[PDB]
Amino acid sequence: AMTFTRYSRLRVIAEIRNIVSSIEFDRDDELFATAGVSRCIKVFDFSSVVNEPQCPIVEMSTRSKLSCLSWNKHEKNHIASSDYEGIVTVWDVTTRQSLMEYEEHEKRAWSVDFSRTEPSMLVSGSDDCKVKVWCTRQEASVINIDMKANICCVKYNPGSSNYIAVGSADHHIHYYDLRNISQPLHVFSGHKKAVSYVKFLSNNELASASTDSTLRLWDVKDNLPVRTFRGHTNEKNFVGLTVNSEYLACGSETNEVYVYHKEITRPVTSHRFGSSYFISAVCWKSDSPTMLTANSQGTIKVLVLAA
Amino acid sequence: LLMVPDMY
């Protein structure tokens, strides 16, 4: 561990005081947004949160409980949401208007992700067992993938809009090339329970979380299992997963945030939240040691890895 | 309640 990591703890540097389902930085890591069961997307200024004694600069009320947020990687002011009615909405946080309301899903949509490299493209996954690919210039879905089980998470590859990872209630990660959706490129088995999150560390490194109380690392160039991470408790809830080039962080049903270095299977450190409660959302500030966290009480903390 | 679905 000493070769790979210089950290032993997480420091709390700010706190905002139900469930927060999603917490995400905008394109420049300047603003962040929260959303969840209270039917409200709240936008905060990160530097104000860190420097001050805590009010959002924008709030947008919604028709349904929110499951996920994804900021646009090109249009600074645009953010997508998925909700419990199945609706995938693109919002403008300056005008507060919904720019697009995509309504084809028949059940709760659990996840939405805006592509980094083709930024008008966004993908969603739903309890209706469909993955839908959307373009912000078109009202109808561009691609539909009919799957056999509830979709819990979808994520675009960071280097190409042709590939998506799909975490399924069937316990597998389905990795698709959107140029030919008749079969996935590869289906990664290993998790013993539903796959609740998928996130990329890099073009070829995919991480997942599952209610089998593990995170797993996968090689999507050569289609190989790499590593399994253990320590946290996650047997039933969406507890959050965030990764960067070197680190994975996830929530726990013990109301603790866990951090792993990608080369080491047991945690570098953990943090007991001030709160019966579970961590519900986490987000790294890009490749820095700073991260946003939130729990089922609605408390938000800014944490930083420290020696 | 934020419960993950599971086909099994």
Residue numbers in the entry:
A (entry chain A): 347 to 363, 372 to 407, 411 to 632, 644 to 675
B (entry chain B): 28 to 35
Please share excerpts from the published article on this structure.
We mapped putative VP motifs in all these proteins and assessed their binding affinities to the COP1 WD40 domain. We could detect binding for most of the peptide motifs in ITC assays, with dissociation constants in the mid‐micromolar range. Next, we obtained crystal structures for the different peptides bound to COP1 (1.3–2.0 Å resolution, see Tables EV1 and EV2, and EV4) to compare their peptide binding modes. We found that all peptides bind in a similar configuration with the VP forming the center of the binding site (r.m.s.d. between the different peptides range from ~ 0.3 to 1.5 Å, comparing 5 or 6 corresponding Cα atoms). In yeast 3‐hybrid assays, we find that, similar to HY5, UV‐B‐activated UVR8 can efficiently compete with HYH and an N‐terminal fragment of HFR1 for binding to COP1.
The COP1 E3 ubiquitin ligase is a central signaling hub that integrates inputs from plant light‐sensing photoreceptors. COP1 contains an N‐terminal zinc finger, a central coiled‐coil, and a C‐terminal WD40 domain, which is essential for proper COP1 function (Deng et al, 1992; McNellis et al, 1994). COP1 regulates gene expression and plays a central role as a repressor of photomorphogenesis by directly modulating the stability of transcription factors that control the expression of light‐regulated genes.
